[PDB]
Symmetry: C3
Subunit: 382 residues, 3 copies
Amino acid sequence: GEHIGAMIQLEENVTVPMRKYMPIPWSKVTYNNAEFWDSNNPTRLVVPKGITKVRVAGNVLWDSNATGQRMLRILKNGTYSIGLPYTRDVAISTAPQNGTSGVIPVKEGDYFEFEAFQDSEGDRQFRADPYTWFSIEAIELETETMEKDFMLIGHRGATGYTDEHTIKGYQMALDKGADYIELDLQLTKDNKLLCMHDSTIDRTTTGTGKVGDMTLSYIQTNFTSLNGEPIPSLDDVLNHFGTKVKYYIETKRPFDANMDRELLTQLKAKGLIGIGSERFQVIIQSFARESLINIHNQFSNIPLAYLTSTFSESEMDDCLSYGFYAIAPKYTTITKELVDLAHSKGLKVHAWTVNTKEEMQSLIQMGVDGFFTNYLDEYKKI
Amino acid sequence: GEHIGAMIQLEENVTVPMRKYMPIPWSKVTYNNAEFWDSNNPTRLVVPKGITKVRVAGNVLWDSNATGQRMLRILKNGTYSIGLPYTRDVAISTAPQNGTSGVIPVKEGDYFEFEAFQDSEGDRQFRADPYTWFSIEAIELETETMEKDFMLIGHRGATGYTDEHTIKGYQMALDKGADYIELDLQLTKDNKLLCMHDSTIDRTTTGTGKVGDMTLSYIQTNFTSLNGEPIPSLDDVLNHFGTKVKYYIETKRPFDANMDRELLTQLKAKGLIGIGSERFQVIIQSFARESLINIHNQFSNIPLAYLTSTFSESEMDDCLSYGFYAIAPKYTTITKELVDLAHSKGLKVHAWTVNTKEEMQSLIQMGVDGFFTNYLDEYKKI
Amino acid sequence: GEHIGAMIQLEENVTVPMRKYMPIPWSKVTYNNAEFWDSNNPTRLVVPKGITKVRVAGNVLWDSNATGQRMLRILKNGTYSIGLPYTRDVAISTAPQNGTSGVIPVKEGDYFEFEAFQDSEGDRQFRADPYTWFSIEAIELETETMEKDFMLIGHRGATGYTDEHTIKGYQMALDKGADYIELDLQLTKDNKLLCMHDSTIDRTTTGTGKVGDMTLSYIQTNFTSLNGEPIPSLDDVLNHFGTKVKYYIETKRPFDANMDRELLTQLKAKGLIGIGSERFQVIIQSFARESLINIHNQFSNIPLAYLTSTFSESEMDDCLSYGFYAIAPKYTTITKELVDLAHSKGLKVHAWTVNTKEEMQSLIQMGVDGFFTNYLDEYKKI
C-alpha cells in the first residue's frame, strides 16, 4: 500500500516562558498525505475522516543550557489520554527529548497537540532543527463493519411461531427476516454447551432435571423438545449456519468464568471471533456486568450489550465508561428523551420482549435501534 | 504481508573516546530481509532499491559510570536529517538510551549511521548487549505511479483546432493524443468554479463582465461560447471524464486561499486527490509560489509545477528547496545546459506555448520533458 | 487491513519497593484484539498463535520525587532479549519514562513483562495514569511457507538414472518425484557460474582443466558431457525452470566471498530470493560455516543447511546458535537418539548419499526429515 500520515516542523525558533505549559505552534509541513494539518490551527494535528487508529511521535531540541528540567508531552483534544508519551529528564547542553506513542483509537475531529515545559532560569528556545519534528501516522482505516442502522432479533428462536431454540426455529426466523438469532446457553455435566433457556429442561423438553446433571450425549439422544425436534448444541448450530448468520448470545446472570471461556473457545474455533472474524457478526449480551468485562478483556472487538430493567442515566454512564456497544432496557421503561440521551452519549438502545405492533411502532417513533421480537412479521406490517 | 527490515547488534564491546563523535561499527546481524547491511561498511544501514519510506530506531547500553552525559543520535548520509531521533541525558549506572524515528522518505543508496557521544572521564564501553541494537524498517514500497517520461499537454483545451475550454475540445484533444488537459478556473459570484481563462467572459463567450459578477447558473444558462458550446463548470468536466483522464490545473496568479480550498474540496470529492487517489493523475501549476506552498501543506502527494519566464539557476534552486515536481519556463528561454542542470537537480522541465514543429523538435533535442502545445498532431509529425 | 495488538493499563497505583526489580501487575485492558492478555497472569503480555513478529512499547509515571534513578525495562520469557528497550535517567518530579522496541521475532507462548526499578529513599508509587500503559503490536503474521514435512532431494541431478548436472537430468528427477534439485557451482575464468561438481571438467565432460582456466562461452561451446548433453550455466537452468522448481544449492568448501556474491546477485535477478521471493523455494548448503554466515548476514530469510560428517551435540548446538535451518550429517552417523535431540533443539536432519532402500527405510524409522538420494524411485518402493 501507501503510507498515510504527516510530519510537521518549525521554521523559526519558538520562545518558551519559564515554568509555563505551551503548545508548540508548528509552522511548516515536511509531508502530509491528506489534510492532517491546518494553517489557521498550527498547534493541532487533525485526524481526517477515514482513520480509526493512529500513532503519534515527536522530538525536541533546546538551546544549550544545563539547568532545570525539560518536558515532552502530547495531548489529545487538549486533555490527557491513554497511550500518549510523557518524558521529563535533567537538562545538559541542548537536552534533546524523543518520544513515541502506541497504537490508540481516534475518531474524525480529534486532534493532538505537542506540549512543552521547561524549568530553567529565563526563557528557553524551542529550536527549529531537523531534530525537532511532530509526526502522526495512521495505523487502521475505516472499513465495512456489516453493521445495520436497525437490527431485528429473533427473540429466543422466534418461538411465537414455532418451537424455541431449535435449528428449524432459527431457520424460520431467518426466513421471516430476522437479522440476529438469540442463543441461550448452559453447561451440561460435561464442558460442552447446550442451547436452552431454562436451567431445568422439563419446561422445554420431554426430559427433566438440571442441564448439568447429565452429559450432553444422553440429553441430546434420550430427550427431545415437546414438538419432537432435536435439542441442538452450540457446535451443531454453528456447523449448520456457520458464517451465513449473525448470532446474538446471552450469558448466565450468575457469573462463571468457565462458561465464558468455553463460549469464547467455541466461537474462535469457527472463526466467528478474533483476528479473522467480522466485528458485528457476533453480539453478546448479559445481565452480569462482570461477564461483559471478562469478555471485553479477552476480545475487545466483540460488541457487547447490557441487559437491564432500570433504564436511567446512571446505567448509560456506567455502560459508556466500560465501552459497551449498546444498552438493552425493558421496552416499558423507554422514552424518546432517554433514547436521545443514549444517542448523544453514543450508545445504541435495544428494546426486548416487544410483541405488539402498536408498541413496536411507538418504539420506532422513539428511535429505538433494535427489537427482540417473538413475532417478527409485525415489523413488516408497520 | 511479510516484514521488510533489518536489525544489527554488536558482538564485542566498542570503546568510545571521551568527547568524540563516533559512528558505531556494528559487527553482526540479528536479521536482515534483503541487503540492508554490508560487511565492508558496518557503520551504515543501507536502503535497498525498492523502498520509499523507512523507520529507524536503536538502543544503547554503556558501562556503569555515573559521570557526564550520554548521547544517542542517528545521521542520514553522514549529516543531519528531518525526523531522526536525538537524545542526551545525565548518566547513572549504565544509563541506557532508547530512541525511535518517525516515517521519513528515502531513496536508493541512502544510509543511516548510529552516532554516539559521551562526556565522562576516560573512555567508555559501548557494550555488546541484547539491549544494544540498531534497526531499520520499511514502511512504503515503490509502486507504479502512472508517470510518463514525456508528457504532452493539451494547452487550454487544444483551442488551435476547436473552441477553448469545453468538453468537446477536451475530448478532441484526448483523441488527438493529449496526455493531460489544461484547466483554467475562476470563482463565480457563488463559491462554485467556472472553467475559463480570462477574468472577463466577453472574449470567450457571448456574455460580458467579470466571472464573479453573477452566479454560476445564470452564466451557464444565459451565455454560451462563441461557437455555441456550453460553458462547463469544474464539476461537469469531472463528471464527464472522471478518472479516465489526467488533469492539469492552473491557479490564479493573485493568491487567494478560498480558490485553492474550493479546488481541493472539489478534487477530493471525486477521489482525484487524497488517500485513494493516484499520485500523477492530477498536476497543479501556478505562477504564485504561495498557492503552491498552500496546496503542498495540505496534499503533499500532489505534484506541483512552477510557471516562470526567467529560467535561471536561482529559480531551479528555489523550486528544489520547496520540493516542486517540475518547473515550467518559457520555451524561448530554454537551453540544453539549463535542461541538464535541472535534470541534475532532479526537476522536470516543461516548455509552454510551443506551437511550431521545428521548435518542438529543437526542444526534444534539448531533452525537455513536456510541452503545452496548442497544436497536438505536430508531435506525431516529428 | 485491521490492527492486531493490545494495550493494558493500571487501575490502582502499584507500590515499588526501593532497589528491587518488580514486574508490573497490570490490572485492566484498554484494548485487546485477540487473547493478548490473561487475568490470572496480569504481568505478562502473551503472543497468540498466529503471529511471527511483534513490537512492544510502554510508558511510566511515578510520584513526585527528585531523588534516585528510575528504570524502564521489558523482558522476554522472563529474561533478556534482543531488540527490547532499556532506559535509566535521573529523576525530577514524576520523571516519566517512555520506550519502544524494534521489530523482533516471536513464537506462540512467548510473553513480555514490564519491569520497573527505582533507587529513591522509601517506596515509590507506580501511578495508574493515562501516561502509564503497556502495549504490544503484531507486525508479521504466519502464512504458507511452501515448506514440506519431508523433503526428497535429487542428489546432484539424480545421476543414478542419467547424466549428472544437466537440464534433462533435472527434469527427469522432477518427473520421478524430486522435491528439490541439487546444484554444484564453480566460477569460470569470467565471473559467470557453471553447474559442475568437480573442479576439473575432465571427469564429467569431454574437456579438461580447471573450470576457471577458460571463459564460460568456450567451455559451453567446445565441450559437452560424456553423454553429449549441454553443460548448462546457472542462468540457463534458472531460465529453463524459473520459479516452477525449488532449488538446492551448495557452495565451495573453500570460502570465497565473490562466489557467494555472484550467486546471490543471480538469484535475486530472477526473484528467487529477497523481498518478492518465497522463503523455502531456495535452500543453500555448505561445508563452510563462514559462507553460511555471510549469506545469512545478507539474506536472513534464506534457509541454510550445514554439511558435516561428525554428527554430534556440539555441531547441533553450534548450528542452533547461528540459526541454521537444518543439519546434514552423513547417514552412517545418524541414530534415532540424535534425530530426537535435533528435533528437540528445533533443527531438521537431512541424510545425504542414501542409495539403498533398506537404509532409507531405517532412516525413515529414525525420523529423518529428508534424503539426498541418487536413486529416487526407491522412496516409492517403501
